[PDB]
Design a protein around this nucleic acid. Structure first.
Ligand code: MG
Ligand code: MG
Ligand code: MG
Ligand code: MG
Ligand code: MG
Ligand code: MG
Ligand code: MG
Ligand code: MG
Ligand code: MG
Ligand code: MG
Ligand code: MG
Ligand code: MG
Ligand code: MG
Ligand code: MG
Ligand code: MG
Ligand code: MG
Lengths: 109, 97, 189, 111, 158, 176, 46, 41, 26
RNA sequence: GCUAAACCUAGCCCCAAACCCACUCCACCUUACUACCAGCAACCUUAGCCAAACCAUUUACAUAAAGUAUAGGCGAUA
RNA sequence: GCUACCUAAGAACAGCUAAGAGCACACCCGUCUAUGUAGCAAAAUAGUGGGAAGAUUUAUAGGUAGAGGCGACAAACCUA
RNA sequence: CCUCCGCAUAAGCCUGCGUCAGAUCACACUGACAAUUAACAGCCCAAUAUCUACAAUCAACCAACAAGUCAUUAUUACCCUCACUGUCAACCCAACACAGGCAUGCUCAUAAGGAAAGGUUAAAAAAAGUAAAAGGAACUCGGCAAAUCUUACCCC
């Protein structure tokens, strides 16, 4: 009668076992006579690029010199897209009619 | 066997410390400082018993009045209990009544 | 490592250390430092007290949690190594750690023990300077690439043209992926 | 991708993309003599069978014929000096059958 | 909520007693709001109203700690607001009448920014405050742009 | 293919493999978005391979050829994550002016302690969500006492800490 | 007869009887939880 | 404990030196020794 | 670990005496 | 000569001062630690042991005035 | 989650004789004896026995809680 | 030689006699490594109205009483497929590797599953059986127990 062991899908009776799961993220819904309905849009499609002719490697040669850190804040970013502004003397008010919403995230990772 | 084998590290003490050399100084401020202050203002301790003797029960009572409102719930409760007990012990249980 | 850990000669992730200080020991901790710390790994230092009193030598290891300097081939006492079978083994002179204050720094010109301060020089900037004598005591201290190594040119190309694009959108553009659909709003709360 | 909030797919909405995948995987030697063409991986719990299939197809360009996952229990028995139970972590195992009769013997490392 | 001695002698039982007041249901007109409210009123309340003459007057006159009802407080607040704004309460065809009514209660009638908060609980007040100073955050980009503009202006000047 | 899950067949059984340094953040910052993405996949495969190797080692009762490399890779990955995330944050700030993407708010629960309730994402409005309305966000008077007690406990702990520190200092002084 | 085994386990019952949700459901239950928290228990509810 | 006893062994000895030559526990066990010793005296 | 010293000293003396009794000098 | 003994520093108590804590990501009121769909809601004198040698009204919860005026089966006591 | 009573939706009852019938398994209870009494057991074992198509036995989930419940009243039973 | 047990499923427990390495009635004890793969089982079913008198008992005759366990229709809405979790064991509740408790489906002497005797001696006393001359209740509170079986009569 352990209180200390973490409650999981292995632990209960049949119904309990059926219900819980691990952190899987469901891929569809369930209907009629327990027929699962896998929706393609719910499934995450991995957007892998082509690595042919890609000169970067997973480690960096020791000979590369040291340099001090610079946390990329917003001000810096603005400065590095301020030339056009300067010339004048590129911004969204809302982003509700936009695919990749910056605030209440749509995009994954 | 409770007693111990190796005799302790020798407790060296400086009797001529800044504390003990100037102990009792100013203590006696009134009788030769035209009573600006009392020596009961010299004593630095708990705010309730600062120039005031008392009993056990009396002390408790004092604590409850002078501090009570800013005491920790549990501690306050304990104090109250003590007071209850103490009163009973004094006013009833005992000898010579 | 838990609290009240005793930093011995062996490092905190070894077998010997484990043997000495397992997770359930409960010894008395040894009292001792400041960032104003002048003894480094590789410095030449003079042993004031104990064995080799007056001798100089190079510093092998510094264990600064215990204010220790380990001197190379000095302050030595003798340890048996190997062994295991029913015989001698072999005989090493192991090095005892020296608590600082017993160990002073040596000048390069004089070869004498000196007390040191961290004076900010005009050259730029922070470095040791001797009090009794003058001048600076400095400091202690090839590659060839592999198959999975970038190179110095390819690391520091810098291709980041900063737009207000997002990584994802840019990636999509690069791909040539086309999404005609749009996201229906959701009640987050 | 593990430990991320998944956006809510309503009905007409877009495909869910994973740019920069979070979970990473390890292929292992089978313990109990499997058939030729079966490959045994250790999936991180949150990743699905379908996801695994997709993952293999994209990043490694392998022709995956079928996938069958399974949740292995990691032992809770085993205690400390304190008598507190150290739990070995529970992990997910994946039986991935290759396509085209490709075949795959797990190679000898450490010769 | 209290206790009684049994026959009003102390040497009998002490025994607990709840004296309840006599509640009634009554209609009530109010000239300030123009509406007929049905309320759980007691006879003392009625008496008080009579003394004060109008119900509205009573509501206004009677202090918040003697009113002893949240509904009453709310009503008072509403009345105050009405007094302040000078809202169309009786609409067209009765402007003169409205004016007269207002003049009847020339006394009272606090500035509008005080009358909003009258008869609120603490929590309610807090909520109101939150609502007031809510606002979606200002994009930093805009701020940056402004700064840039300022800089440009400065440059021009020098 | 599945050849990528192991390293070069030359390196099997060496006990020492050369693989220099992690990606520092500055370098990552200097690189493009697409480029970064590309690098990520390179990293990922390597990581997987390393994991596999580790597993193999565990199986065989033998030690890893060079376990620092795995660590380095991990570090690099972390750096990459940080850089991109930072950029995203900056973008968000520029556009909407929001620290954190996922929305939430300060909510007092049943137990009285104020929590950052992160918002969960739904199809229907909160007012007719049957489950959400059960999840109550308010205290009631029976909690205040408990809160007070908790506070007191916290204070006691703090006191203990502080006095202990003082004692230690005193001891040190005595010693030297 | 032998009366030692009063306990006769079934998880569902336990969860209904003694679960977090049940505790939450009343003020008393809430108070219990609070008390446990104060004490510093590793398992507040079942 | 403020002030508790350190010189206890000695007290025990003070009785036990006389019981040294008795039979049985009496010569070891203080509780028994004391009674015997007193009687002897 | 009790608070005293005198007792300890006494014990030490006793021990010494015992030692003397046991293995006396020439 | 075995069992054993022995050992200081872990920390803690009382104060003084000063008003505390609480979001890496993810999860957590449904069977908490559970990605994703149409219903209710908090406030309501403490009591009793005990003392009165039983028990039934009753029985406490800075200094000084003062244990004074008062109260009280005019007693316990307050 | 024991037991007392109930609610929901379930399950079980061979064989022979001819209905809260008879004999008699499985199941339920527990008459008498012996053993056991720091026990195999904080009420058991061996036999012998009452019932065993019914006011039967029983698995699951829910309900009634102490100034109470529940009770074919034994002042039973309500986690030794 | 036993088999009054066995294999499943349910509930419960949660890696608890698999491999290697290691130590210390006799050697399931510690560390590492491995394992249970869905088709079985859970995890369901878009609205609004509208329909559902005639048991079960081989359902057929008979025969009842306590009166019962398995259904739609109309209209509108609707192309997307097989995700997620249980799957080990010599096992649960009785403080124990406890003669006790423990639902259902098959198996009714077993094709499963097991071992009453560490060795020796053969005293008393004690326990469980089997034995019996002649007699046959003379036993004892009582034919309790045992053995063979069955007559009559009260009380309640
Ligand atoms: Mg009394
Ligand atoms: Mg008395
Ligand atoms: Mg009496
Ligand atoms: Mg019958
Ligand atoms: Mg019968
Ligand atoms: Mg009776
Ligand atoms: Mg009776
Ligand atoms: Mg099985
Ligand atoms: Mg038992
Ligand atoms: Mg067999
Ligand atoms: Mg045997
Ligand atoms: Mg034997
Ligand atoms: Mg005979
Ligand atoms: Mg006779
Ligand atoms: Mg006779
Ligand atoms: Mg008989």
């Amino acid at each position: 009668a352990d209180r200390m062991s973490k409650w999981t899908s292995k632990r209960g009776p049949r119904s309990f076992r059926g219900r819980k799961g691990r952190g899987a993220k469901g891929i569809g819904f369930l209907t009629s006579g327990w027929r699962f309905v896998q929706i393609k849009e719910m499934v995450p499609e991995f957007v892998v690029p082509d690595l042919t002719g890609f000169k970067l490697k997973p480690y960096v040669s020791y000979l590369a010199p040291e340099s001090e850190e610079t946390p990329l804040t917003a001000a810096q970013l603005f400065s590095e897209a301020v030339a056009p502004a300067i010339e004048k003397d590129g911004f969204e008010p809302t982003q509700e009619g936009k695919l990749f919403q910056l605030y209440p995230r749509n995009f994954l990772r | 066997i409770g007693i111990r084998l190796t005799l302790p590290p020798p407790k060296v003490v400086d009797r001529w410390n800044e504390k003990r050399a100037m102990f009792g100084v100013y203590d006696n401020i009134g009788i030769l400082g035209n009573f600006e202050k009392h020596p009961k203002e010299l004593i630095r301790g708990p705010i309730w018993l600062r120039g005031w003797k008392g009993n056990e029960l009396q002390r408790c009572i004092r604590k409850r009045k002078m501090v009570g409102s800013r005491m920790f719930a549990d501690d306050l409760h304990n104090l109250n209990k003590r007071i209850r007990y103490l009163y009973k012990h004094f006013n009833r249980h005992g000898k010579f009544r | 490592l838990p609290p009240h850990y005793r930093y011995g000669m062996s490092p905190p992730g070894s077998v010997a250390d484990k043997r000495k200080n397992p997770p359930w020991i409960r010894r008395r901790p040894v009292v001792v430092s400041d960032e104003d710390w002048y003894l480094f790994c590789g410095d030449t230092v003079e042993i004031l007290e104990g064995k080799d009193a007056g001798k100089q030598g190079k510093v092998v290891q510094v264990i600064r949690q215990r204010n220790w300097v380990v001197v190379g081939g000095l302050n030595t006492h003798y340890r048996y190594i190997g062994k295991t079978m029913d015989y001698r083994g072999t005989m090493i002179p192991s090095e005892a750690p020296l608590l600082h204050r017993q160990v002073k720094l040596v000048d390069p010109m004089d070869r004498k023990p000196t007390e040191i301060e961290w004076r900010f020089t005009e050259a730029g900037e922070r470095v040791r300077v001797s009090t009794r004598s003058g001048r600076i005591i400095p400091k202690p201290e090839t590659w060839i690439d592999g198959p999975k190594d970038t190179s110095v040119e390819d690391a520091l190309e810098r291709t980041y043209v900063p737009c207000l694009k997002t990584l994802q959108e840019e990636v999509m553009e690069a791909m040539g992926i086309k999404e005609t659909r749009k996201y229906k709003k959701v009640y987050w709360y | 991708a593990r430990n991320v909030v998944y956006p809510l797919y309503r009905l007409g909405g877009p495909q869910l993309r994973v740019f920069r995948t979070n979970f990473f995987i390890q292929l292992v030697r089978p313990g109990v003599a499997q058939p030729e063409d079966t490959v045994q991986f250790r999936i991180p719990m949150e990743m699905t069978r379908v996801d695994l299939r997709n993952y293999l197809e994209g990043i490694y360009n392998v022709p995956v014929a079928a996938v069958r996952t399974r949740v292995q229990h990691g032992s809770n028995k085993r205690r400390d000096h304190r008598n507190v139970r150290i739990k070995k972590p529970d992990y997910k195992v994946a039986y991935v059958q290759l396509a085209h009769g490709q075949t795959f013997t797990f190679p000898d490392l450490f010769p | 909520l209290g206790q009684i001695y049994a026959n009003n002698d102390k040497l009998s039982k002490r025994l607990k007693k709840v004296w309840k007041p006599q509640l009634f249901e009554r209609e009530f007109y109010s000239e300030i709001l123009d509406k007929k409210f049905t309320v759980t009123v007691t006879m003392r309340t009625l008496d008080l109203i009579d003394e004060a003459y109008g119900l509205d007057f009573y509501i206004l006159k009677a202090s918040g700690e003697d009113l002893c009802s949240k509904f009453g407080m709310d009503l008072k607040r509403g009345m105050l607001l009405r007094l302040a704004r000078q809202d169309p309460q009786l609409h067209p065809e009765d402007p003169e009448r409205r004016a007269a009514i207002y003049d009847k209660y020339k006394e009272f009638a606090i500035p509008e920014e005080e009358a909003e908060w009258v008869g609120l609980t603490l929590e309610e007040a807090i909520e109101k405050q939150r609502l007031l100073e809510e606002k979606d955050p200002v994009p930093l980009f805009k701020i940056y742009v402004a700064e840039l503009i300022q800089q440009l202006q400065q440059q021009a000047l020098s | 293919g599945l050849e990528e899950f192991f390293d070069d067949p030359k390196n099997w059984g060496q006990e020492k493999v050369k693989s220099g340094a992690a990606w520092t953040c500055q370098q990552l910052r200097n690189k493009s978005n697409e480029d970064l993405h590309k690098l990520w996949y390179v990293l990922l495969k390597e990581r997987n391979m390393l994991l596999t190797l580790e597993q193999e080692a565990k199986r065989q009762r033998l030690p890893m050829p060079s376990p620092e490399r795995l660590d380095k890779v991990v570090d690099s990955m972390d750096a990459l994550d940080k850089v991109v995330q930072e950029r995203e944050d900056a973008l968000r700030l520029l556009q909407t002016g929001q620290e954190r993407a996922r929305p939430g708010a300060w909510r007092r629960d049943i137990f009285g302690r104020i929590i950052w309730h992160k918002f969960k994402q739904w199809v229907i409005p909160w007012h007719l969500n049957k489950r959400y309305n059960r999840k109550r966000f308010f205290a009631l008077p029976y909690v205040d006492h408990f809160l007070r007690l908790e506070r007191e406990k916290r204070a006691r702990i703090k006191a203990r800490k502080e006095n202990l520190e003082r004692k230690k200092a005193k001891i040190l002084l005595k010693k030297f | 007869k032998a009366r030692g085994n009063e306990y006769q386990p079934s998880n569902i019952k336990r969860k209904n009887k003694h679960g977090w949700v049940r505790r939450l459901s009343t003020p008393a239950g809430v108070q219990v939880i609070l008390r446990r928290m104060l004490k510093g228990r590793k398992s507040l509810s079942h | 404990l403020r002030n508790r006893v350190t010189d206890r062994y000695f007290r025990i000895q003070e009785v036990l030196k006389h019981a040294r030559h008795f039979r049985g526990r009496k010569n070891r066990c203080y509780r028994l020794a004391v009674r015997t010793v007193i009687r002897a005296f | 670990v009790k608070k005293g010293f005198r007792a300890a000293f006494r014990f030490q003396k006793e021990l010494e005496r015992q030692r003397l009794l046991r293995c006396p000098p020439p």
